[PDB]
Write a protein that binds this ligand. Structure first.
Ligand SMILES: COC(=O)c1ccc(C[NH3+])cc1
Length: 340
């Protein structure tokens, strides 16, 4: 309710809407870049480290195969991802620098963050101390305050999507499930361990699912494993809907209290979804040592700085089979992707 935050968010929304209404398109092409390395791969796309041939800058180029996007029912999702990313601007979101398409693929050319995914660092270290988890959590809280004020739901919070930058701060990547939603939406998406009960139960759900996922993330960062862990998805889902969570004895009382309010099965009682909105989270005791403005301004010294040798270093990412980027001589799926 600080007039300061109100005016910040009002300007943020004005700027977002202008870009949302008139999206950029076709701002580079493939032969402006050299291919370096595959950084990730999935059922309909890949992320490739590339270097711009004129500037020498490195980028993470997400390449989506239009035919596979169609087959796996991701058309609208890919259009969401690009339209949202070209319109947002926040310190903890990876920046989309260029986008374009060709006969075969869609391309989103993002700033490359060489420090790696939080997932790798968390697994390597085991767990994060509460201060370390809190530093990251505060960045997600502010990011969700920003996104939700724009009527955006993120829907893919998990450690793999949180890159650690050169200053040790988070950059959220992968807007593949992000959507502009006034009210409710219905698509089943997200990784099993992070799904809110109302997603599992096929309800019309809202931004409260992001706050649930933050609870899962904070738990996993501080414990080293997620709260509803089980060997198969159906067993995970039974635990999620049950309303039962066990906390390690090393968790502080303040942490347990915050988590009970984020991991609240009843979405109408969940922190982030009450009348006081995000302030129930920002004002919670677990965040008492957090200077929200200093986090936003990146003035807090980070818990650690990833080790890397320079902007082209791939040592914090892992190795994948290197496959061709073939571009068909014939246009595929042109109609479906006209707006991209
Ligand atoms: C800005 O995006 C990146 O730097 C990046 C994204 C995804 C991966 C692999 N999951 C690696 C790097």
């Amino acid at each position: 309710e600080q007039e300061s935050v109100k005016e910040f968010l009002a300007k943020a929304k004005e700027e977002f809407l202008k870009k949302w209404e008139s999206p950029s398109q076709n701002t580079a092409q493939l032969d402006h870049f050299d291919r370096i390395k595959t950084l990730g791969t999935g059922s309909f796309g890949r992320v490739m480290l590339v270097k711009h041939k004129e500037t020498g800058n490195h980028y993470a180029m997400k390449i989506l195969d239009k035919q596979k996007v169609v087959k796996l029912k991701q058309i609208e999702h890919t259009l969401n991802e690009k339209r949202i990313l070209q319109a947002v601007n926040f310190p903890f979101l990876v920046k989309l620098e260029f986008s374009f398409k060709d006969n075969s693929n869609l391309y989103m050319v993002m700033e490359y963050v060489p420090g790696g995914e939080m997932f790798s660092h968390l697994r390597r270290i085991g767990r994060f101390s509460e201060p370390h988890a809190r530093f990251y959590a505060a960045q997600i809280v502010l990011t969700f305050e920003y996104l939700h004020s724009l009527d955006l739901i993120y829907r893919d919070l998990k450690p793999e999507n949180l890159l650690i930058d050169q200053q040790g701060y988070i950059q959220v990547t992968d807007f593949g499930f992000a959507k502009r939603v006034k009210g409710r939406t219905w698509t089943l998406c997200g990784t099993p361990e992070y799904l809110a009960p109302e997603i599992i139960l096929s309800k019309g759900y809202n931004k409260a699912v992001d706050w649930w996922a933050l609870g899962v993330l904070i738990y996993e960062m501080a414990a080293g494993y997620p709260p509803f862990f089980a060997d198969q998805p159906i067993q995970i889902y039974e635990k999620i809907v049950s309303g039962k969570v066990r906390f390690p004895s090393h968790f502080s009382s303040d942490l347990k209290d915050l988590l009970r309010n984020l991991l609240q099965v009843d979405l109408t009682k969940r922190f982030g979804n009450l009348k006081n909105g995000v302030n129930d989270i920002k004002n919670h005791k677990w965040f008492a040592t957090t200077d929200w403005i200093a986090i936003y301004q990146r003035k807090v010294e980070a818990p650690f700085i990833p080790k890397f040798k320079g902007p082209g270093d791939t040592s914090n990412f892992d190795d994948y089979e290197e496959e061709e980027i073939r571009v068909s001589i014939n246009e595929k799926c042109g109609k479906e992707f006209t707006e991209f």
